[PDB]
Design a protein around this ligand. Structure first.
Ligand SMILES: *S(=O)(=O)CCCCCCCCCCCCCCCC
Length: 309
C-alpha cells in the first residue's frame, strides 16, 4: 500500500485546486514550496556556508560536518531536487543533515542556478564546476580525495549522474560513489518506462508537473535526448562511479531509476538499487514526519556510509 503519513500528505495536496501549468510561473511555484511541513533538523558538529566564485557566477555552498568523524573526511557533494526550478539550500537542509549524520560524511550542499533564469545546461555546469572547486580544495576541507561522492534527489540525482559522466570525460575529479535518490536519469521519450504512465497522477510529482519543469529548464525538443539531460542515453557508461539508486513505488520516475541501474550494470559499473514500496517521489522531504520516509532516508544515508567506509 501507501505510507500513512504520505497518504495524508496527498490528501491535503489534492484538496487544493488542480495546478494550472499553462500559467504557473517559476516565482509562483517557488512560493508553493513553503507548503512543505516543518521537519526535524538532525544535529551535526558544524554547519558552514561559503561562496564559490566561478566564472560567470558565485554559487553558495552549505557544508555539514557530522559529529564524531575524524579527518581526512569522506565527503558528499549534494545537489538538491526541485525540477531544476525550485528548491535551495534551505529546502533540503534537513535532508543534508541526515546524510551527513548517518552517512558519516561531510556534505556540501550546492546552491546551483535555477531555470528559467538559467536554462539548461547551467545547472549541469554548476554541478560539475562545484565538484571541481570542492575537490580542488580537498586539503582546505580536510577531505580524503579518494572518498568524495556526488549525490542528489530527483533533478539533483540527475545532476549527480551527469556530473559523474563529465568528470569521466574531463579526467576528474575522482568520484568514489554516486548517491542517486529517485533520480531523473532520463530515457528515450519515444519509449518511456512503464512507471511514467502508471504514476502520472496523484503522487505529488506528476506528469504535468514534470512537463512544466521541462518547459522551464530545456530550450528545445531535441534536448530531451541530450546526454546532459538524459544521462542514460550517454553512449558509454562504463568506468562511472559505483552507485546506489533509491526509487519510490509511486514515483513516475520509478522505472527511470531502474533503467539507469540496468544501464550502469550493463556497462560493468557496480550498482545497487532499492525500491521503497510504500513511498512517493520526494519522500526524503518528509523525514521525521512519515515513518516510511524516515527509515528510507536513514537507510540511504547508511548506504552512503558503507560506500565511503
Ligand atoms: S524532480 O526534481 O523532478 C522532483 C521535484 C519535486 C517538485 C515538487 C514540487 C512540490 C510542490 C509541493 C507542494 C507540497 C506540499 C506538501 C505538503 C502538503 C501536505
Amino acid at each position: 500500500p501507501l505510507d500513512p503519513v504520505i497518504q495524508q500528505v496527498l490528501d491535503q495536496l489534492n484538496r487544493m485546486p488542480a495546478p494550472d501549468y499553462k500559467h504557473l510561473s517559476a516565482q509562483q511555484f517557488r512560493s508553493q514550496q513553503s507548503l512543505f511541513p516543518p521537519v526535524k533538523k538532525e544535529p551535526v558538529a558544524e554547519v558552514r556556508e561559503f561562496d564559490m566564485d566561478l566564472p560567470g557566477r558565485t554559487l553558495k555552498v552549505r557544508m555539514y560536518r557530522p559529529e564524531g568523524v575524524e579527518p581526512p573526511y569522506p565527503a558528499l557533494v549534494y545537489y538538491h531536487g526541485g525540477g531544476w526550478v525550485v528548491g535551495d539550500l534551505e529546502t533540503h537542509d534537513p535532508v543534508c543533515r541526515v546524510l551527513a549524520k548517518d552517512g558519516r560524511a561531510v556534505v556540501f550542499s550546492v546552491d546551483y542556478r535555477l531555470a528559467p533564469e538559467h536554462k539548461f545546461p547551467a545547472a549541469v555546469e554548476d554541478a560539475y564546476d562545484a565538484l571541481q572547486w570542492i575537490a580542488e580544495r580537498a586539503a582546505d576541507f580536510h577531505l580524503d580525495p579518494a572518498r568524495i561522492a556526488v549525490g542528489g534527489d530527483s533533478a539533483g540525482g540527475n545532476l549527480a549522474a551527469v556530473t559523474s559522466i563529465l568528470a569521466k570525460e574531463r579526467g576528474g575529479p575522482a568520484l568514489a560513489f554516486q548517491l542517486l535518490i529517485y533520480p531523473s536519469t532520463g530515457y528515450d521519450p519515444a519509449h518511456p518506462p512503464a512507471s511514467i504512465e502508471e504514476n502520472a497522477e496523484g503522487y505529488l510529482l506528476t506528469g504535468g508537473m514534470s512537463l512544466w519543469f521541462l518547459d522551464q529548464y530545456l530550450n528545445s525538443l531535441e534536448e530531451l535526448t541530450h546526454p546532459w539531460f538524459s544521462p542514460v542515453l550517454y553512449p558509454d557508461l562504463s568506468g562511472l562511479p559505483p552507485a546506489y539508486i533509491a526509487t519510490a513505488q509511486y514515483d513516475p520516475l520509478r522505472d527511470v531509476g531502474k533503467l539507469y541501474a540496468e544501464a550502469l550494470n550493463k556497462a560493468g559499473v557496480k550498482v545497487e538499487i532499492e525500491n521503497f514500496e510504500d513511498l512517493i517521489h520526494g519522500f526524503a522531504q518528509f523525514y521525521s514526519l512519515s515513518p516510511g520516509a524516515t527509515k528510507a532516508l536513514v537507510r540511504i544515508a547508511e548506504k552512503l556510509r558503507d560506500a565511503l567506509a
